[PDB]
Specification:
Distance between the termini: 21 Å
Number of domains: 1
Name: Hypothetical protein NMB1532
CATH architecture: Up-down Bundle
Entry title: NMB1532 protein from Neisseria meningitidis, unknown function
Radius of gyration: 17 Å
Order of helices and strands: HHHHH
Keywords: structural genomics, APC83866, unknown function, Protein Structure Initiative, Midwest Center for Structural Genomics
PDB class: structural genomics, unknown function
Number of strands: 0
Strand content: under 5%
Assembly: monomeric
Bound molecules: chloride ion, manganese (II) ion
Length: 161
Amino acid sequence: VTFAEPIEMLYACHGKVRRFCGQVAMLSDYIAENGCNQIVLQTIRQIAQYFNVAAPLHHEDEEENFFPLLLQYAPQAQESVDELLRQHIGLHDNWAAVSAEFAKLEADNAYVPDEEAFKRFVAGYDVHLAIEEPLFDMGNTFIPKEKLTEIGEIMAARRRK
Ligand SMILES: [Cl-]
Ligand SMILES: [Mn+2]
Ligand SMILES: [Mn+2]
């Protein structure tokens, strides 16, 4: 998939979010069973790269380009978009909490991490994606193809800096 199909790109990012959330959901039990071993440290490094760097770019794609274009063609999505934007703030705060547990693990491999931070993070994304993905489908249905090609070019540029 390419930025030429921007909605397929948004879904591809969601596949990454789901994979990493699945790992966060496993973390507490894996650590209890095995310790905070090098597999844990590697895994948490990769999760943190995604949520510190890539996820905010995905949120920007939605806020700056996709949601506004969706609303030109599907204004009935307004309340849902507004709630998803409120939720992005919650997603950032949940991620900050997980990030702080990751730093504690890195500093002290005997640390027992706060499982509630992990569960809250996973659940926040579950709730968010269930609301959001329907709007991706609305966008496929209602947004002209050439308008999607146009936001695709902007999204591609965001990754360069
Ligand atoms: Cl998202
Ligand atoms: Mn999304
Ligand atoms: Mn979102």
